[PDB]
Design a binder for these strands. Structure first.
Ligand SMILES: Nc1nc2c(ncn2[C@@H]2O[C@H](COP(=O)(O)OP(=O)(O)O)[C@@H](OP(=O)(O)OP(=O)(O)O)[C@H]2O)c(=O)[nH]1
Length: 403
RNA sequence: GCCUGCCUUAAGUAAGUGGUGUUGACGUUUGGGUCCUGCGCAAUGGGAAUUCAUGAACCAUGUCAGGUCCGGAAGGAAGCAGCAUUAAG
C-alpha cells in the first residue's frame, strides 16, 4: 500500500523520457542512469549498492537493443524492474513452520523500532491469514509499561500474554512460556525481547541466553525504516552478534525514500519478511519485492440487485485475488483520474437505497414524482437520481456490448 | 218461370251417430279449474345493509431499517418488506 513515494517521484520523470522513445542509444541509457544514480543516492541507498546496481543495469540495457528492437524502452524498464526486484530480495520469503509445534519466533531490535506493536501485528496476521493459534510473551522487563502495553494488545486480539512480572529473568520467562505452549497446543510463540536506545554488551548477552534456552526457528529484527542507513547498520550488528533469519521493516507509512529496504539484503543477506504500515494491529503485510519494484517505477502488472452487489463489493468488499491487488495497486497506477467518490460514493449508496423492492427490480418503472419522492428521501433533488439512472443505462449498454 | 237451387236471407220439420241444457236461476249435474283481466297483500327465488380471515411508493398510518442536515452528543427522518393498516379485492 504505502512507501517509496519520493524515490518514485524522482525516477519516474527520467523513466518517462526513455519509455516514450522506443529507440535506445548509448547516450540515452547513460543519461537515464545518471538520474537513477542520483535518485538512489538521495534516497539514502547504500553507496556500494548504488554503484553495483547502476553497473549491472547499464550493462544489460545496451545489449538489450541488440537483445530486441521491439518495445526497446519498455525493455529498459523491465531490466530496471528486474534488478530492483533482486535488490529487495528475489521473491516473497515466507514464515518458517517448525516440524514440531510450537514455532518459536524471537523479536529483537532497539527501543522505538516497534517491537512490542509488531509482535501483536504478527500474532494477528498468523491467526487471520494462516489460521494459527499464537501466544505472546513478555520478555522485556526493563521498562515499566512494557508489559501492560503487550497485555493491552493481547486483550484486543483475545490471545494470551505470558508474564511473570519484572523481577524474573527473561531466560526463565521464555522457558516456561514455551512449555505452557506445548501443553496447551499453541502453534506459535512470539517473544517480545528487551532493548535500549543503542546496542550494548548486556543486551546481547541476554539475547544469546534467550536464543539458547528457546532454540527459536525465526529471529526477526524489527527496525525503523525511516532511519535509512542507520537501520542497515543495526541489522549488520544484530546479524553478527546473534543470528538473524528475517527483518520486519516498520513505519513505511512515513518513509518516502526507501534506502533501508533497497539495501538490507545486499549488506546483510537477511531477507525482509514483513512491512509495518501503521499504528493499528492490522497494518502488517508480507514484503513482496516484485510489487514494490513495480510501484517504484509506476508500472502495473436485476439492476437493483447488481447495484447493491457492486456497492457491497466496492465500498467495503475491497480485496481482489489472482493479481487483482497487484494490477490495482495505487488505484491501478492512478488511471489518469484524480477524483474518488468517497462521500460522493456514500451519497450514491444512500440514493441507491431510496427505493422499494419493485423499484429495485424495475428501475424504469419510477415515474417523475415517483423518484421525486425518492430524491426527497435521498437528499439530491433530481441530480443524484438522474445521474444514477444514466450510470445504470451506461452499465446496461456496456453489458450489452460485452455480451 | 222456386217445374230443380233463395241451401248463403225472419224457426225448423226427421230415421243415423258421442252427449245436452232451457218452467227448475231445483237436484243423482260425481273427479278439474271457480279472479281469466287491475287494485293492498303473504309460501317461493334472484342480487343484500351487515359477520370472520387478507390487502395503499409518493397519497390520508404512531417512533414503525438506514444515509443528509440541525448538533462534540440526541431526536426529527423513502415508517422502504412489518406493525394498527381502514372504505376500496
Ligand atoms: N505510523 C506507524 N507507527 C508505528 C509502526 N510500528 C510501530 N509504530 C509506533 O512506534 C512507536 C514505538 O512502538 P513500540 O511497540 O513501543 O516499539 P518498541 O517495543 O521497540 O519500543 C509506537 O508509537 P509511539 O511511542 O507513540 O511513537 P512516538 O510518539 O515515540 O513517535 C508505535 O505506534 C508503523 O508501522 N507505522
Amino acid at each position: 500500500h504505502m512507501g517509496f513515494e519520493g524515490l518514485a517521484d524522482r525516477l519516474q520523470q527520467t523513466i518517462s523520457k526513455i519509455r516514450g522513445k522506443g529507440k535506445v542509444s548509448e547516450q540515452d541509457v547513460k543519461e537515464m542512469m545518471r538520474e537513477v544514480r542520483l535518485a538512489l543516492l538521495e534516497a539514502d541507498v547504500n553507496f556500494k549498492v548504488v554503484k553495483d546496481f547502476v553497473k549491472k543495469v547499464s550493462e544489460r540495457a545496451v545489449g538489450q537493443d541488440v537483445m530486441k528492437s521491439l518495445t526497446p524502452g519498455q525493455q529498459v524498464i523491465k531490466v530496471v524492474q528486474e534488478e530492483l526486484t533482486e535488490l529487495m530480495g528475489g521473491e516473497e520469503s515466507k514464515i518458517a513452520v517448525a516440524k514440531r509445534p510450537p514455532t518459536v519466533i524471537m523479536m529483537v531490535g532497539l527501543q522505538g523500532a516497534g517491537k512490542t506493536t509488531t509482535s501483536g501485528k504478527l500474532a494477528n496476521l498468523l491467526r487471520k491469514k494462516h489460521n494459527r493459534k499464537p501466544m505472546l510473551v513478555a520478555a522485556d522487563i526493563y521498562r515499566p509499561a512494557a508489559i501492560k502495553q503487550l497485555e493491552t494488545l493481547g486483550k484486543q486480539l483475545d490471545m494470551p500474554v505470558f508474564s511473570l512480572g519484572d523481577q524474573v529473568s527473561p531466560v526463565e520467562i521464555a522457558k516456561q512460556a514455551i512449555e505452557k505452549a506445548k501443553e496447551e497446543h499453541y502453534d506459535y510463540v512470539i517473544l517480545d525481547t528487551a532493548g535500549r536506545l543503542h546496542i550494548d554488551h548486556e543486551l546481547m548477552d541476554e539475547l544469546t541466553n534467550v536464543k539458547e534456552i528457546a532454540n527459536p526457528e525465526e529471529i526477526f529484527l524489527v527496525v525503523d525504516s525511516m532511519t535509512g542507513q542507520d537501520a542497515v547498520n543495526v541489522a549488520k550488528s544484530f546479524n553478527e552478534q546473534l543470528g538473524l533469519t528475517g527483518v520486519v521493516l516498520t513505519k513505511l507509512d512515513g518513509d518516502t525514500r526507501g534506502g533501508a529496504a533497497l539495501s538490507i539484503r545486499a549488506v546483510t543477506n537477511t531477507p525482509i519478511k514483513f512491512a509495518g504500515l501503521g499504528e493499528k494491529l492490522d497494518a502488517l503485510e508480507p514484503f513482496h519485492p516484485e510489487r514494490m519494484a513495480s510501484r517504484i517505477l509506476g508500472m502495473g502488472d436485476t439492476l437493483d440487485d447488481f447495484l447493491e452487489q457492486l456497492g457491497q463489493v466496492r465500498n467495503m468488499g475491497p480485496l481482489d485475488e489472482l493479481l487483482q491487488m497487484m494490477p490495482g495497486a495505487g488505484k491501478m497506477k492512478g488511471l489518469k483520474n484524480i477524483q474518488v467518490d468517497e462521500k460522493q460514493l456514500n451519497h450514491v449508496e444512500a440514493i441507491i437505497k431510496s427505493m422499494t423492492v419493485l423499484e429495485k427490480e424495475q428501475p424504469d418503472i419510477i415515474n417523475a414524482s415517483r423518484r421525486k419522492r425518492i430524491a426527497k428521501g435521498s437528499g439530491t433533488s433530481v441530480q443524484e437520481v438522474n445521474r444514477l439512472l444514466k450510470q445504470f443505462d451506461e452499465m446496461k449498454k456496456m453489458m450489452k456490448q460485452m455480451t
